[PDB]
Amino acid sequence: IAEIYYERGTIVVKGDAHVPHAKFDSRSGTYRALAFRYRDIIEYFESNGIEFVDNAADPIPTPYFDAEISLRDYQEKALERWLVDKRGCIVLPTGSGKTHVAMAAINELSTPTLIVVPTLALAEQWKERLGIFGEEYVGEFSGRIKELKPLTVSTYDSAYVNAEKLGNRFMLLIFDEVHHLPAESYVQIAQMSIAPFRLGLTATFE
């Protein structure tokens, strides 16, 4: 029987020996893939009607969100385009409409979400902004506090260092790229996360 599980930011696959992007690891005697390949491996099992056990994903229990989705027309335009693959980047003119489309997305897919923002300061803002979902579901994971709520905002720093710990607890990954972040900060965090849904955010202005 097919089974997968997570560790050190990688997916271990037992059973199927022809799983995509999974390579054989002679040290362990197993196939292994970077955690972000999680989604592909899943769609591979399901698509081929293959039976499997998911010991990889360990989703934080998240409620059904149904709050005030107030966006601008162009803001709601993109959201719907990103909703097709739920794995892309969104460029927005505004900037407060960035922290807006994000909110919208979270609300649509009521799944555990990690929000990576540079600087604590910017995290503090996002927390109190996520409150329109329930202050009790909003957490912060940083050098200041390491809490894991269904909606946790983290700093590029804290997220990079605890990739092991955050990697399999979220299904939706959001990057608040303020002027964009390093291909060693940004890229590295993404790669070790199993999160099948990714949303990168940038504000042309400010």
PDB file of C-alpha atoms in Angstrom:
ATOM      1  CA  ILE A   1       0.000   0.000   0.000  1.00  0.00           C
ATOM      2  CA  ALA A   2       1.129   3.557  -0.908  1.00  0.00           C
ATOM      3  CA  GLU A   3       2.073   5.924   1.944  1.00  0.00           C
ATOM      4  CA  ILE A   4       3.846   9.238   2.369  1.00  0.00           C
ATOM      5  CA  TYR A   5       5.065  11.174   5.347  1.00  0.00           C
ATOM      6  CA  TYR A   6       7.021  14.341   6.133  1.00  0.00           C
ATOM      7  CA  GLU A   7      10.414  15.141   7.639  1.00  0.00           C
ATOM      8  CA  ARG A   8      13.210  17.699   7.469  1.00  0.00           C
ATOM      9  CA  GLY A   9      11.194  19.459   4.809  1.00  0.00           C
ATOM     10  CA  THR A  10      11.002  16.388   2.596  1.00  0.00           C
ATOM     11  CA  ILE A  11       8.357  13.841   1.669  1.00  0.00           C
ATOM     12  CA  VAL A  12       9.176  10.168   2.060  1.00  0.00           C
ATOM     13  CA  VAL A  13       7.297   7.839  -0.231  1.00  0.00           C
ATOM     14  CA  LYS A  14       6.905   4.114   0.459  1.00  0.00           C
ATOM     15  CA  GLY A  15       5.198   1.833  -2.055  1.00  0.00           C
ATOM     16  CA  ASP A  16       4.869   3.285  -5.582  1.00  0.00           C
ATOM     17  CA  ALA A  17       8.410   3.395  -6.962  1.00  0.00           C
ATOM     18  CA  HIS A  18       7.514   5.634  -9.916  1.00  0.00           C
ATOM     19  CA  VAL A  19       6.298   8.724  -8.131  1.00  0.00           C
ATOM     20  CA  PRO A  20       7.180  12.044  -9.935  1.00  0.00           C
ATOM     21  CA  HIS A  21      10.049  14.188  -8.666  1.00  0.00           C
ATOM     22  CA  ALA A  22      10.733  11.559  -6.028  1.00  0.00           C
ATOM     23  CA  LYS A  23      14.273  10.205  -6.159  1.00  0.00           C
ATOM     24  CA  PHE A  24      15.738   7.109  -4.550  1.00  0.00           C
ATOM     25  CA  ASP A  25      17.707   7.763  -1.378  1.00  0.00           C
ATOM     26  CA  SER A  26      20.268   5.022  -0.799  1.00  0.00           C
ATOM     27  CA  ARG A  27      20.916   6.147   2.758  1.00  0.00           C
ATOM     28  CA  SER A  28      17.369   5.402   3.830  1.00  0.00           C
ATOM     29  CA  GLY A  29      16.454   2.964   1.083  1.00  0.00           C
ATOM     30  CA  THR A  30      13.462   5.118   0.154  1.00  0.00           C
ATOM     31  CA  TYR A  31      12.201   7.560  -2.440  1.00  0.00           C
ATOM     32  CA  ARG A  32      12.245  11.162  -1.321  1.00  0.00           C
ATOM     33  CA  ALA A  33      11.081  14.551  -2.633  1.00  0.00           C
ATOM     34  CA  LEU A  34      11.193  18.175  -1.486  1.00  0.00           C
ATOM     35  CA  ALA A  35       8.074  18.961   0.517  1.00  0.00           C
ATOM     36  CA  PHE A  36       6.548  21.370  -2.044  1.00  0.00           C
ATOM     37  CA  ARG A  37       6.171  18.438  -4.423  1.00  0.00           C
ATOM     38  CA  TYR A  38       3.462  17.230  -2.072  1.00  0.00           C
ATOM     39  CA  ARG A  39       0.646  18.522  -4.236  1.00  0.00           C
ATOM     40  CA  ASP A  40       2.013  16.839  -7.367  1.00  0.00           C
ATOM     41  CA  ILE A  41       2.426  13.529  -5.595  1.00  0.00           C
ATOM     42  CA  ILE A  42      -1.125  13.684  -4.331  1.00  0.00           C
ATOM     43  CA  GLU A  43      -2.637  14.564  -7.720  1.00  0.00           C
ATOM     44  CA  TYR A  44      -0.521  11.706  -9.041  1.00  0.00           C
ATOM     45  CA  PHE A  45      -1.942   9.137  -6.658  1.00  0.00           C
ATOM     46  CA  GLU A  46      -5.550  10.262  -6.944  1.00  0.00           C
ATOM     47  CA  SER A  47      -5.374  10.721 -10.722  1.00  0.00           C
ATOM     48  CA  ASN A  48      -4.156   7.143 -11.213  1.00  0.00           C
ATOM     49  CA  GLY A  49      -6.691   5.806  -8.727  1.00  0.00           C
ATOM     50  CA  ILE A  50      -3.790   4.711  -6.538  1.00  0.00           C
ATOM     51  CA  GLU A  51      -4.528   3.902  -2.893  1.00  0.00           C
ATOM     52  CA  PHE A  52      -2.375   5.722  -0.375  1.00  0.00           C
ATOM     53  CA  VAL A  53      -1.908   6.882   3.223  1.00  0.00           C
ATOM     54  CA  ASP A  54      -1.105  10.511   3.950  1.00  0.00           C
ATOM     55  CA  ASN A  55       1.170  10.701   6.995  1.00  0.00           C
ATOM     56  CA  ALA A  56       2.696  13.845   5.501  1.00  0.00           C
ATOM     57  CA  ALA A  57       0.049  16.547   5.975  1.00  0.00           C
ATOM     58  CA  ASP A  58      -0.722  17.486   9.568  1.00  0.00           C
ATOM     59  CA  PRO A  59      -3.237  20.372   9.085  1.00  0.00           C
ATOM     60  CA  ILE A  60      -4.067  22.647  11.966  1.00  0.00           C
ATOM     61  CA  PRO A  61      -7.832  22.357  12.647  1.00  0.00           C
ATOM     62  CA  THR A  62      -9.432  25.305  10.874  1.00  0.00           C
ATOM     63  CA  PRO A  63     -13.075  26.524  10.993  1.00  0.00           C
ATOM     64  CA  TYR A  64     -15.355  27.506   8.137  1.00  0.00           C
ATOM     65  CA  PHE A  65     -14.720  31.183   7.372  1.00  0.00           C
ATOM     66  CA  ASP A  66     -17.581  33.350   6.146  1.00  0.00           C
ATOM     67  CA  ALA A  67     -16.734  37.013   6.814  1.00  0.00           C
ATOM     68  CA  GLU A  68     -17.056  40.395   5.005  1.00  0.00           C
ATOM     69  CA  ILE A  69     -15.331  39.964   1.613  1.00  0.00           C
ATOM     70  CA  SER A  70     -15.237  43.653   0.563  1.00  0.00           C
ATOM     71  CA  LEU A  71     -12.862  44.070  -2.379  1.00  0.00           C
ATOM     72  CA  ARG A  72     -12.453  46.526  -5.288  1.00  0.00           C
ATOM     73  CA  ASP A  73     -13.492  45.222  -8.684  1.00  0.00           C
ATOM     74  CA  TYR A  74      -9.948  44.777 -10.003  1.00  0.00           C
ATOM     75  CA  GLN A  75      -9.033  43.239  -6.622  1.00  0.00           C
ATOM     76  CA  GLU A  76     -11.782  40.639  -6.972  1.00  0.00           C
ATOM     77  CA  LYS A  77     -10.756  40.141 -10.592  1.00  0.00           C
ATOM     78  CA  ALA A  78      -7.314  38.720  -9.766  1.00  0.00           C
ATOM     79  CA  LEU A  79      -8.527  36.656  -6.848  1.00  0.00           C
ATOM     80  CA  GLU A  80     -10.693  34.704  -9.259  1.00  0.00           C
ATOM     81  CA  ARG A  81      -7.828  34.220 -11.663  1.00  0.00           C
ATOM     82  CA  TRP A  82      -5.519  32.984  -8.905  1.00  0.00           C
ATOM     83  CA  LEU A  83      -8.305  30.667  -7.704  1.00  0.00           C
ATOM     84  CA  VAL A  84      -7.875  28.545 -10.782  1.00  0.00           C
ATOM     85  CA  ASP A  85      -4.634  26.915  -9.651  1.00  0.00           C
ATOM     86  CA  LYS A  86      -4.368  28.454  -6.201  1.00  0.00           C
ATOM     87  CA  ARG A  87      -0.625  28.407  -6.726  1.00  0.00           C
ATOM     88  CA  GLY A  88       0.588  31.711  -8.126  1.00  0.00           C
ATOM     89  CA  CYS A  89       1.555  35.323  -7.604  1.00  0.00           C
ATOM     90  CA  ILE A  90      -0.660  38.418  -7.609  1.00  0.00           C
ATOM     91  CA  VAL A  91       0.494  41.916  -8.442  1.00  0.00           C
ATOM     92  CA  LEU A  92      -1.624  44.781  -7.103  1.00  0.00           C
ATOM     93  CA  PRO A  93      -1.481  48.547  -7.625  1.00  0.00           C
ATOM     94  CA  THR A  94      -2.625  49.441  -4.153  1.00  0.00           C
ATOM     95  CA  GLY A  95      -0.945  47.911  -1.080  1.00  0.00           C
ATOM     96  CA  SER A  96      -3.742  47.929   1.490  1.00  0.00           C
ATOM     97  CA  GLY A  97      -5.585  46.068  -1.237  1.00  0.00           C
ATOM     98  CA  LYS A  98      -2.855  43.467  -0.957  1.00  0.00           C
ATOM     99  CA  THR A  99      -3.708  42.745   2.648  1.00  0.00           C
ATOM    100  CA  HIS A 100      -7.238  42.694   1.241  1.00  0.00           C
ATOM    101  CA  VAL A 101      -7.117  40.099  -1.520  1.00  0.00           C
ATOM    102  CA  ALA A 102      -5.186  37.960   0.970  1.00  0.00           C
ATOM    103  CA  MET A 103      -8.054  38.153   3.444  1.00  0.00           C
ATOM    104  CA  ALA A 104     -10.426  37.260   0.660  1.00  0.00           C
ATOM    105  CA  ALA A 105      -8.471  34.135  -0.296  1.00  0.00           C
ATOM    106  CA  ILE A 106      -8.182  32.897   3.265  1.00  0.00           C
ATOM    107  CA  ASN A 107     -11.938  33.332   3.560  1.00  0.00           C
ATOM    108  CA  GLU A 108     -12.686  31.316   0.415  1.00  0.00           C
ATOM    109  CA  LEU A 109     -10.598  28.265   1.293  1.00  0.00           C
ATOM    110  CA  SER A 110     -11.122  27.773   5.007  1.00  0.00           C
ATOM    111  CA  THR A 111      -7.826  25.892   5.359  1.00  0.00           C
ATOM    112  CA  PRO A 112      -4.852  26.433   7.793  1.00  0.00           C
ATOM    113  CA  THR A 113      -2.818  29.385   6.565  1.00  0.00           C
ATOM    114  CA  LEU A 114       0.716  30.644   7.060  1.00  0.00           C
ATOM    115  CA  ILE A 115       1.366  34.302   6.232  1.00  0.00           C
ATOM    116  CA  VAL A 116       5.044  35.152   5.851  1.00  0.00           C
ATOM    117  CA  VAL A 117       5.866  38.851   6.168  1.00  0.00           C
ATOM    118  CA  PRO A 118       9.195  40.625   6.610  1.00  0.00           C
ATOM    119  CA  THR A 119       9.699  42.404   9.933  1.00  0.00           C
ATOM    120  CA  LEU A 120       7.674  41.805  13.054  1.00  0.00           C
ATOM    121  CA  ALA A 121       6.150  45.261  12.651  1.00  0.00           C
ATOM    122  CA  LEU A 122       4.412  44.151   9.446  1.00  0.00           C
ATOM    123  CA  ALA A 123       3.325  40.943  11.165  1.00  0.00           C
ATOM    124  CA  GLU A 124       1.753  42.879  14.020  1.00  0.00           C
ATOM    125  CA  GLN A 125      -0.302  44.701  11.412  1.00  0.00           C
ATOM    126  CA  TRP A 126      -1.494  41.515   9.716  1.00  0.00           C
ATOM    127  CA  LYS A 127      -2.483  39.898  13.000  1.00  0.00           C
ATOM    128  CA  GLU A 128      -4.766  42.739  13.981  1.00  0.00           C
ATOM    129  CA  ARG A 129      -6.410  42.701  10.555  1.00  0.00           C
ATOM    130  CA  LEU A 130      -7.037  38.981  10.615  1.00  0.00           C
ATOM    131  CA  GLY A 131      -9.235  39.594  13.632  1.00  0.00           C
ATOM    132  CA  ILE A 132     -12.247  39.706  11.299  1.00  0.00           C
ATOM    133  CA  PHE A 133     -12.051  35.902  11.462  1.00  0.00           C
ATOM    134  CA  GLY A 134     -11.824  35.629  15.217  1.00  0.00           C
ATOM    135  CA  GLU A 135      -8.914  36.857  17.274  1.00  0.00           C
ATOM    136  CA  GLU A 136      -8.750  33.357  18.768  1.00  0.00           C
ATOM    137  CA  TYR A 137      -7.831  31.737  15.426  1.00  0.00           C
ATOM    138  CA  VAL A 138      -5.050  34.190  14.718  1.00  0.00           C
ATOM    139  CA  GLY A 139      -1.553  33.392  15.875  1.00  0.00           C
ATOM    140  CA  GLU A 140       1.990  34.632  15.545  1.00  0.00           C
ATOM    141  CA  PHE A 141       5.071  32.525  15.043  1.00  0.00           C
ATOM    142  CA  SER A 142       8.167  34.624  15.505  1.00  0.00           C
ATOM    143  CA  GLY A 143      11.207  35.086  17.700  1.00  0.00           C
ATOM    144  CA  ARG A 144       8.740  36.945  19.907  1.00  0.00           C
ATOM    145  CA  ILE A 145       6.156  34.136  20.232  1.00  0.00           C
ATOM    146  CA  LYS A 146       5.782  30.706  18.605  1.00  0.00           C
ATOM    147  CA  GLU A 147       2.071  29.924  18.491  1.00  0.00           C
ATOM    148  CA  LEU A 148       0.327  27.752  15.893  1.00  0.00           C
ATOM    149  CA  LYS A 149      -3.228  28.841  15.105  1.00  0.00           C
ATOM    150  CA  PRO A 150      -5.139  28.053  11.879  1.00  0.00           C
ATOM    151  CA  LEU A 151      -4.089  31.551  10.791  1.00  0.00           C
ATOM    152  CA  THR A 152      -0.518  32.280  11.774  1.00  0.00           C
ATOM    153  CA  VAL A 153       1.551  35.167  10.514  1.00  0.00           C
ATOM    154  CA  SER A 154       5.287  34.693  10.493  1.00  0.00           C
ATOM    155  CA  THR A 155       8.388  36.683   9.562  1.00  0.00           C
ATOM    156  CA  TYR A 156      10.644  35.636   6.694  1.00  0.00           C
ATOM    157  CA  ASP A 157      13.205  34.990   9.432  1.00  0.00           C
ATOM    158  CA  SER A 158      11.246  32.894  11.904  1.00  0.00           C
ATOM    159  CA  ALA A 159       9.684  30.919   9.043  1.00  0.00           C
ATOM    160  CA  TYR A 160      13.047  30.138   7.451  1.00  0.00           C
ATOM    161  CA  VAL A 161      14.511  28.864  10.713  1.00  0.00           C
ATOM    162  CA  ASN A 162      11.451  26.769  11.674  1.00  0.00           C
ATOM    163  CA  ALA A 163      10.749  25.355   8.237  1.00  0.00           C
ATOM    164  CA  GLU A 164      10.812  21.910   9.799  1.00  0.00           C
ATOM    165  CA  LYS A 165       8.067  22.822  12.273  1.00  0.00           C
ATOM    166  CA  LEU A 166       5.836  24.838   9.935  1.00  0.00           C
ATOM    167  CA  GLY A 167       6.319  22.755   6.782  1.00  0.00           C
ATOM    168  CA  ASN A 168       3.406  20.342   7.124  1.00  0.00           C
ATOM    169  CA  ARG A 169       0.891  22.196   9.263  1.00  0.00           C
ATOM    170  CA  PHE A 170      -0.494  24.501   6.543  1.00  0.00           C
ATOM    171  CA  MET A 171      -2.347  24.017   3.265  1.00  0.00           C
ATOM    172  CA  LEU A 172      -2.224  27.645   2.202  1.00  0.00           C
ATOM    173  CA  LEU A 173       1.009  29.617   2.058  1.00  0.00           C
ATOM    174  CA  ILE A 174       0.973  33.363   1.570  1.00  0.00           C
ATOM    175  CA  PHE A 175       4.053  35.500   0.936  1.00  0.00           C
ATOM    176  CA  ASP A 176       3.858  39.196   1.611  1.00  0.00           C
ATOM    177  CA  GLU A 177       6.672  40.260  -0.702  1.00  0.00           C
ATOM    178  CA  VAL A 178       7.279  43.871   0.257  1.00  0.00           C
ATOM    179  CA  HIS A 179       9.650  45.006  -2.517  1.00  0.00           C
ATOM    180  CA  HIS A 180      10.285  41.240  -2.833  1.00  0.00           C
ATOM    181  CA  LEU A 181      12.330  38.950  -0.587  1.00  0.00           C
ATOM    182  CA  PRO A 182      15.551  36.904  -1.237  1.00  0.00           C
ATOM    183  CA  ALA A 183      15.538  33.777  -3.399  1.00  0.00           C
ATOM    184  CA  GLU A 184      17.136  32.157  -0.340  1.00  0.00           C
ATOM    185  CA  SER A 185      14.532  33.414   2.128  1.00  0.00           C
ATOM    186  CA  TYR A 186      11.437  33.254  -0.050  1.00  0.00           C
ATOM    187  CA  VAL A 187      12.327  30.265  -2.230  1.00  0.00           C
ATOM    188  CA  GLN A 188      13.807  28.267   0.632  1.00  0.00           C
ATOM    189  CA  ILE A 189      10.687  28.572   2.823  1.00  0.00           C
ATOM    190  CA  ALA A 190       8.352  27.603  -0.016  1.00  0.00           C
ATOM    191  CA  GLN A 191      10.382  24.524  -0.999  1.00  0.00           C
ATOM    192  CA  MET A 192      10.230  22.899   2.474  1.00  0.00           C
ATOM    193  CA  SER A 193       6.481  23.470   2.853  1.00  0.00           C
ATOM    194  CA  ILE A 194       3.929  20.913   1.625  1.00  0.00           C
ATOM    195  CA  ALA A 195       1.295  23.659   1.303  1.00  0.00           C
ATOM    196  CA  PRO A 196      -0.568  22.907  -1.915  1.00  0.00           C
ATOM    197  CA  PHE A 197      -1.810  26.489  -2.118  1.00  0.00           C
ATOM    198  CA  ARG A 198       0.530  29.387  -2.631  1.00  0.00           C
ATOM    199  CA  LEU A 199      -0.225  33.080  -2.931  1.00  0.00           C
ATOM    200  CA  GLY A 200       2.568  35.614  -3.358  1.00  0.00           C
ATOM    201  CA  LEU A 201       1.708  39.281  -2.868  1.00  0.00           C
ATOM    202  CA  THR A 202       3.273  42.552  -4.157  1.00  0.00           C
ATOM    203  CA  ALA A 203       2.093  46.203  -4.215  1.00  0.00           C
ATOM    204  CA  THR A 204       3.320  48.219  -7.194  1.00  0.00           C
ATOM    205  CA  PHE A 205       2.869  51.260  -4.926  1.00  0.00           C
ATOM    206  CA  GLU A 206       4.528  51.523  -1.502  1.00  0.00           C
TER     207      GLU A 206
END
